[PDB]
Amino acid sequence: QALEKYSRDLTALARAGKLDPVIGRDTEIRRAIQILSRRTKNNPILLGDPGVGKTAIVEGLAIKIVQGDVPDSLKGRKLVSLDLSSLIAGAKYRGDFEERLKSILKEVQDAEGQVVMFIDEIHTVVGAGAVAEGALDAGNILKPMLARGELRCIGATTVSEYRQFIEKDKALERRFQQILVEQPS
């Protein structure tokens, strides 16, 4: 709330048997877990073309969490996927857009690491120019939060978009660990 409105709860979906089995991704999922367990460089970012099924890896992580197959750092966590398009479409002015986004993210922060957030197309929230001037830019809120390590976050994007919008930003580069997803599975 409005986290519930503007996110999909992957851990809840996992518990209901609503996520498809993920095969051939044990290594990638294990790596994401290791990354999420670290002090600073602890935001895994899945890189690969759309056709490799990056979201499935996040769904696999949700599955592992709910069966308790994770370190103390992730035991009992809720894993949510942020729905930015719905937030953008539902707002018209910068003020209330940012207030609603801050409200969602404060709820995550107040959970003090009990909530992990997946952000797909993450280059679109880093305030590096993917969002048009004059358009509603989540980067105003998410760039500083991510750069300061205020979120437990998994991201996804393409290699080229990562290199364009995230690479060269030393603050984000420091926080993120790339996981290359080479082939569909």
Automatic annotation (TrEMBL):
It comes from the Eukaryota. This is Chaperone protein ClpB1. It comes from Plasmodium falciparum (isolate 3D7). The chain holds residues 312 to 496 of 1070 of the full protein.
